[PDB]
Design an enzyme around this catalytic site. Sequence first.
Site, mmCIF file in Angstrom:
data_model
loop_
_atom_site.group_PDB
_atom_site.id
_atom_site.type_symbol
_atom_site.label_atom_id
_atom_site.label_comp_id
_atom_site.label_asym_id
_atom_site.label_seq_id
_atom_site.Cartn_x
_atom_site.Cartn_y
_atom_site.Cartn_z
ATOM 1 N N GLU A 1 -7.630 0.406 -104.296
ATOM 2 C CA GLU A 1 -7.932 -0.228 -105.574
ATOM 3 C C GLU A 1 -8.113 0.855 -106.629
ATOM 4 O O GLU A 1 -9.049 1.639 -106.550
ATOM 5 C CB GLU A 1 -9.219 -1.062 -105.482
ATOM 6 C CG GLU A 1 -9.601 -1.744 -106.793
ATOM 7 C CD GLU A 1 -10.804 -2.677 -106.672
ATOM 8 O OE1 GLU A 1 -11.853 -2.264 -106.140
ATOM 9 O OE2 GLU A 1 -10.704 -3.840 -107.124
ATOM 10 N N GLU B 1 -18.779 -10.085 -103.076
ATOM 11 C CA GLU B 1 -17.589 -10.309 -103.871
ATOM 12 C C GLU B 1 -17.150 -8.872 -104.093
ATOM 13 O O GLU B 1 -17.691 -8.167 -104.960
ATOM 14 C CB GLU B 1 -17.961 -10.988 -105.187
ATOM 15 C CG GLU B 1 -18.566 -12.406 -105.056
ATOM 16 C CD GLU B 1 -17.537 -13.474 -104.658
ATOM 17 O OE1 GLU B 1 -16.340 -13.297 -105.029
ATOM 18 O OE2 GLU B 1 -17.899 -14.504 -104.005
ATOM 19 N N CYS C 1 -11.593 -7.181 -110.730
ATOM 20 C CA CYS C 1 -11.571 -7.381 -109.295
ATOM 21 C C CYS C 1 -10.248 -8.006 -108.837
ATOM 22 O O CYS C 1 -9.721 -7.661 -107.778
ATOM 23 C CB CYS C 1 -12.755 -8.275 -108.879
ATOM 24 S SG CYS C 1 -12.830 -9.916 -109.674
ATOM 25 N N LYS D 1 -30.513 -6.801 -110.255
ATOM 26 C CA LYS D 1 -30.441 -5.361 -110.467
ATOM 27 C C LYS D 1 -29.068 -5.011 -111.076
ATOM 28 O O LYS D 1 -28.074 -4.829 -110.355
ATOM 29 C CB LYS D 1 -30.671 -4.641 -109.127
ATOM 30 C CG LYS D 1 -30.788 -3.117 -109.203
ATOM 31 C CD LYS D 1 -29.454 -2.508 -109.542
ATOM 32 C CE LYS D 1 -29.517 -1.021 -109.618
ATOM 33 N NZ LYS D 1 -28.151 -0.503 -109.886
#
Lengths: 494, 494, 494, 494
Positions: free
Chosen positions: A393, A262, A296, A186
């Site tokens: 972040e 992750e 990331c 997806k």
Amino acid sequence: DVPAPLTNLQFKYTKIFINNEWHSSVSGKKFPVFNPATEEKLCEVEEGDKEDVDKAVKAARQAFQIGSPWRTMDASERGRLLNKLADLIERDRLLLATMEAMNGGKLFSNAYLMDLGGCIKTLRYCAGWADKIQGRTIPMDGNFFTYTRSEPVGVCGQIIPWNFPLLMFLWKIGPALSCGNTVVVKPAEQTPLTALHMGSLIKEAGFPPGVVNIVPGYGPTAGAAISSHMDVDKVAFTGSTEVGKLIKEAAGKSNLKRVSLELGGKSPCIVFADADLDNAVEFAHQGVFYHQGQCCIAASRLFVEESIYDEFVRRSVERAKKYVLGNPLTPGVSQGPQIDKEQYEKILDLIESGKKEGAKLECGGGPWGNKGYFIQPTVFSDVTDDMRIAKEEIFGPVQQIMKFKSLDDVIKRANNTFYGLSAGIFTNDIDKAITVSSALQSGTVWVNCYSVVSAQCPFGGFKMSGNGRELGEYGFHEYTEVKTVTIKISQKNS
Amino acid sequence: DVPAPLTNLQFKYTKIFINNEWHSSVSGKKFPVFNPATEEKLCEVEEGDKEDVDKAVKAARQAFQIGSPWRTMDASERGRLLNKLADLIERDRLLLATMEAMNGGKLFSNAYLMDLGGCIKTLRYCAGWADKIQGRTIPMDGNFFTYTRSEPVGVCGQIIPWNFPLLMFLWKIGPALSCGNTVVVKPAEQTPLTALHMGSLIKEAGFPPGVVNIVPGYGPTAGAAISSHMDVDKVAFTGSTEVGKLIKEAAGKSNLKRVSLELGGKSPCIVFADADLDNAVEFAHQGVFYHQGQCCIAASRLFVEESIYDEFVRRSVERAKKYVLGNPLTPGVSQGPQIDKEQYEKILDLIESGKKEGAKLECGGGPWGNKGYFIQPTVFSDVTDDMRIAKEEIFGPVQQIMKFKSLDDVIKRANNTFYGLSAGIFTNDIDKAITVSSALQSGTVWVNCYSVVSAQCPFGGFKMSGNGRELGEYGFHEYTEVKTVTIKISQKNS
Amino acid sequence: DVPAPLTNLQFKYTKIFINNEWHSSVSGKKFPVFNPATEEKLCEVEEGDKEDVDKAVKAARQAFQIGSPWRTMDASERGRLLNKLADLIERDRLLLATMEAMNGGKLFSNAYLMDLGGCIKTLRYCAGWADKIQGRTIPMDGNFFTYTRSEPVGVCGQIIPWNFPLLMFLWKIGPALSCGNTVVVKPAEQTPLTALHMGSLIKEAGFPPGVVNIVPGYGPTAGAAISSHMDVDKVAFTGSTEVGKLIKEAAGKSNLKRVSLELGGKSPCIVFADADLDNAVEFAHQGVFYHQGQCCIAASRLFVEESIYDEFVRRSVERAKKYVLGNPLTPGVSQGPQIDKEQYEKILDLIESGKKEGAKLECGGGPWGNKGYFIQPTVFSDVTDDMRIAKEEIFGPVQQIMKFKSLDDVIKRANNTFYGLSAGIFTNDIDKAITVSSALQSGTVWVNCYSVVSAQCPFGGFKMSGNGRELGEYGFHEYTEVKTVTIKISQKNS
Amino acid sequence: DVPAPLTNLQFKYTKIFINNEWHSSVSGKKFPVFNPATEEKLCEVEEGDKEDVDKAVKAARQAFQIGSPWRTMDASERGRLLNKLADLIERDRLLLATMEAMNGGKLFSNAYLMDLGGCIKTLRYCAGWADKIQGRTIPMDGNFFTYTRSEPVGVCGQIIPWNFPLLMFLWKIGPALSCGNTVVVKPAEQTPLTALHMGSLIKEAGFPPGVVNIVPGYGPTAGAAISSHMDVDKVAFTGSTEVGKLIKEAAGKSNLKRVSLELGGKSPCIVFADADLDNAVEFAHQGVFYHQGQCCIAASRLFVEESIYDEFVRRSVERAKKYVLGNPLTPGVSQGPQIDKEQYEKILDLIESGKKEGAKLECGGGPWGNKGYFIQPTVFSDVTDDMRIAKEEIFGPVQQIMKFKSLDDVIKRANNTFYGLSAGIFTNDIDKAITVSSALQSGTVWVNCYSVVSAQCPFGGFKMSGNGRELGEYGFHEYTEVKTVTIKISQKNS
Ligand SMILES: NC(=O)c1ccc[n+]([C@@H]2O[C@H](COP(=O)([O-])OP(=O)(O)OC[C@H]3O[C@@H](n4cnc5c(N)ncnc54)[C@H](O)[C@@H]3O)[C@@H](O)[C@H]2O)c1
């Protein structure tokens, strides 16, 4: 030496991929896919939801049945198919790179050399593992013959992000298929296009119908249907830690399916006075600003030792002023737009908090242009641990630079976060290289370099930056389910 | 040749074990621990709760700090300590066995030979792995030197059941400590005694304070505090699938800690006409009735082929009539009580449903005695898949016998359940042995035997019977956290 | 569905391959290469000797130097090159198959489907291992950081036989190159042609000069120069046990180079009364007669249980009469010639001894034709262990059938030989399958099948049938040299 | 804190150990065993020869038979026995250390803390591997089930040296027995005593008769009988490269038995100007002088960079003058005698050649004392590569110091030798640490340390310093024989 990007690309694959066939959304609904740099609609894609996911899962379940083509097939044939898919990606490299750059606001030269190159290398790596997935024969107690089978986990639902669309796609299906699993991918609602194109390549390579099913659409809808599905044996997810939490919960409230995550990060980058300054500045720069800071592993916390702090900042600000913002498909542009308005406004709010909390604004610190979601390469110095920009972040072109004195306090500060995806250490001291990297709580630790991710290396984070590892030898074990078979025998012999 | 059990055992360890010291519950509260067979109170234990768990976690966190004794210690010394603990269990074998039988309603001869024997063997196995936990050096692309470290996961909270108290205790701490983790064990409120005694043995063996912390108490309290704790890196649980769900959710709603689960089951046991009938009947019998049917791998679904069905039932009913219920500490008794009233009433309700849904009652089918929670060895024939006793885990001395005709339909029926912990196959056909065991969706599959679990064998279930594997080589990987260290070098060489 | 073989093939590669260049023999001498079936000369090849070997070794040594292209190259690139070589074999498949059949007296359809197919599959398997050859990080005692490097062995001299020319060639260079070694291959003087053609394909694939050097010529000359060379780190040999002895001695008298051997055999094939008779007869048939009985694993000792002995013999003689001898390139021919006159006369002498020692001659037992070295499919019954044909490797279309009564005596007889390459067991009993195969002293043991050799399976023999294993995971470790690197550090952490 | 050595030790074990029984030599002959330091006879031992070896081999063969106690025994029980043997060595530690020092001219404190400590640690390490020796299940092509068995090699003859008698003894039997092999150990004629004592401990631990057989005696006699024996499956040897050659040849001329060798060396020790000078001088000193320079890894070639060369030599000569020669059992003595006269005279001849070829004599350079074979700690500077003392293994207290300028020429010189057992690198540069150690052709490479050998580390040399690795994970694979078992099945599933 990269070829010219395509201009008139006509879209062909915009439907849901189930059983190697293209389906319209059961609801009939479609959703628009835009170009981040221009804000213009590229095309419309079928909006997959729960009912579309149920069809995909049944197809994947049927393809995983004992005796089906995919399960009786030789492991070596499974590898040959993966290599054939890589051959098709090699052939359609220009189209995929252009499409990727257009949909993701990604610089074309990078999409062509880096993203597509990694795509090919990952598949070829996975291909090699296929017939090398082995079990064990265990010398247990008593007269028994015991061996294990490293079977596939089964139906694996895989939900991926928008920052590296095609790469994330292959990072998930590569290992999974190499091990014999069937998947239901997806892709992010912002970047489904390259993933859908892969459907045609997967069918053309010769993969049995149902082995790979792709369901484009939104997260709370199609994604949630996957995480809470009662017939999905495992969910692999890459994205925000916020959604990661929801994924693990959904897995618990429903089928107790395996979960691998992750998530983001707030990767610290420690530079000691005895390090090669030039090397450190460049790596640390690319480490935060690559792909408009939408990585990331972005080195969002740059700790520099006092004695070389002021100097390091000067070069960092200098280096950050060498960027040309614009369309990622146009030659000369060295920085594209952010993915969408949501992300753009999140970065601005964080930049603004940095200003309000006393961070020292060195570069940019505001938006750019009138068409697209651009942001000026921003740099902040004298950033403190308690600051909002030093904790959350950002996922934007914003660099944080801190000051440290002692080896112990800098390690404590580097580890004082719920994240732990990666970290960087710059020093020419053999002992600090080994002992400090052992002391840092991060999945990957680079020494005198940064952002070096390879197919043969396991990747994942400590703490809230994820569960499990991807790629490498260990990553493939995450895609198998161990079965112990114990047979009673008359008399055992060593 | 088993020694006589102790009678006057006086209890000494009844407190919370933190930092090798004994603490009273912060609340001051205590809870009673009874003897399943007589209903009399053995003693009272400190009732650990969230505040007691917080103290234990901080102690475990402190023991896991870089530079602490436990982390700088040689891996080989870690193994020597585990072997020393096994030596102390060997010494206190009689006391532990008696105590285990008294607190758990467990037959003494079994507790002495089987449970304590497995306890010792597990520790010795774990001991050997300690200095053999290795990482890799990866030949990645470019000029870099890359190696991995198989580090410990960190602070591991471990919640265990009441059916095999001491064994579950060592199954958890063995691998964990062998790998260098620090743990916070929370034993079942029904059987904390042998676990607490181990605290003194752990301190006597020489383990650094904080490496093992034991917090007795209830589940929704002390257990939930562990699963949702923000500083626990991993939770290992063995018990009901119902609680397992809560554990995984808690892990998601809080820190995203790693989760490993070993839940119940509804293990199918397929017997083909060409199998050795005697062998099949005995194994299938022990497989369901062992420890008053209170086993995770209980063969609660015995599928027998029509041609040998009636005969198999006769022997099974015959075999089930050879039991003497009573105190597990008294010579001659071949069947003890169930753990408590809750469990006892759960078994009766299921037995009752079996009667009401048309199952054929061959044996018992009702309670026994007036002191303790005993139940008559019950056997049911002509059981259908839709029956409640054929779907839900009974966890009592109740056997289900079904009839099957075709190889394909029996496999489908054996796999039609959300469980998948284990299974058994009885046949003398080489092909059915291999292909059928490959087709069954169960973690462990026994051929011509059953209940054979060893230390060198990974154990866990497919689907909702658990996540991950315990013991064996694979089980130890579940207790490590992989870190990739990539160093930039001038020039790489193969 | 195999294409028609080529007729006019013109030879191009007939020289010594060194540094990707073609050299004439230093001596100037050449040697004739014939067609086994017709006895006509195909062409002449440079006769390599010691001075030609010295040039090849220096080239291989230079290609293995630190910093050379082959050693700094990415392991993944090494795999890509191997896959590219497989692509070139796929392309030249018809030429290689025809040439192989012509030079080796090998049936074309088999050379095209079996030999060339195995060639391609072996290379693709090896390709996958290249970047997966990993070392370890060892948790040793004290404050040190220790890791190992799985480096290549270095310069590997590889001497191969004439029965499977191209396949043996790739079986050797595949693993070697995959691991980063440089080789000096010395093909059999009877069949150098396909090996030399590979030289052009190796150069075309892009392998650095010196990585693969091919020196055609005789054994006592070119081969001996390799085994006793002072700068060859390892010698890999496949052939007669007689020469194998000389190889190991030469290695000892000179450099103490690593030695791996794959020698002949006298593979026993045990058939129990409870086995599937049809299956057993066919496998046992192909097991001895494949490629005119010129196989290392030939089932030259067929032990059949008394109760089914007479019947088994009838079908075996029946099956052995269905062969058409002739040119292996002509449609319809089901049996080609032996490699040469020496081999032909060796088989006759053994057949003659079988007759003289009382063996019961069922089939053939004599030569055939006037052009070529053909032999009639021979079958012998009532063969005793002491017979010469039951002890020595015939390497010709000659089958031995024995009688046995007890399970213990048959295993003793099957193991009473200095050979131990492989064995076959036919039974439907699960226990005999496992326990008997454990009891047989043979490298590979087939159950209810035979001759099944795959790339992912290690292959080698016990006792005098060889040293070490080839292919599979274990086979690749034979091509690496382990180095332990221990670094002193201030403080170690788990 | 080491206890006082024993004085009156009476000898008890002086016979040949076969089947846990003590035998007199078949010939009746005995040979004297002396004390290196005093030259007085300690006692006499049975002189084993070929006929004694034949008895030992048959006993070892019988103990390895299918169904024998040693082969049906649980792998875990095999580990428990090894740990029990270590317990017995721990108990008899004082006796073994005293006996070792007396027979080997070895300093007592070292024999007690280092040798005996390593003996215990090696056995405990081996113990852990026993039930962890596993095979694989291979996903090969076609419908087959394939798994491998890591079986023992069989009867292993092990020939050991006199420099570390007991340690070498356990280094050989530890791994071998851990894997299930039966051995026939042949200790050096100079130091059989501690090995014979182990026989009683092996019998007392409970090992089945025939598992360990010890045959004392000379090399050309008992040793040669082992290397050329037709029923020995493998020979493990540690000693001179000269004999190693003979061993490999013997193996070739007879049974083609597997061969593993650990030969001498001429280990280079490179010290760069940027290294910690103190650390380098001490390690390099112990690296050559430990155990009177009688070590396989002795750093007999110390390369020091010009800029720090003169200074390094001063400290090295300084450090070498701090030694007291005398009886190794007497407190205060810091240097014992050489093993015997032959070795003593070999060291003198080399020292003399050093003087004659222009080497600069810094220390000693001559004998010492009148009772025993002592030699003064000798140091030579300005040693050139062509010198005899720079090429041949001295095996005496003699250090060679060379000068080097460039990184490339020093590596070339360090690798220019047929040896390659080990090497040392001293530098604080991360890059030289990694790249230079990768470039050196030595089995073990130490960085900023030396002589660090551990049980969990594989040990062996490149080139003529040996074949194969000992200890560690890789070392145990050298003691197994792989068997592939392929079973035909109806249909395979991943
Ligand atoms: N898999 C097994 O071996 C096993 C063992 C015990 C129980 N069970 C099953 O469960 C049924 C009931 O048994 P039970 O209630 O004693 O088992 P449980 O799962 O409730 O108990 C197991 C352990 O988990 C703890 N726990 C309970 N509530 C908790 C919560 N909310 N959060 C965190 N931890 C918690 C307990 O206190 C105990 O230490 C049985 O009839 C049987 O089917 C299976």
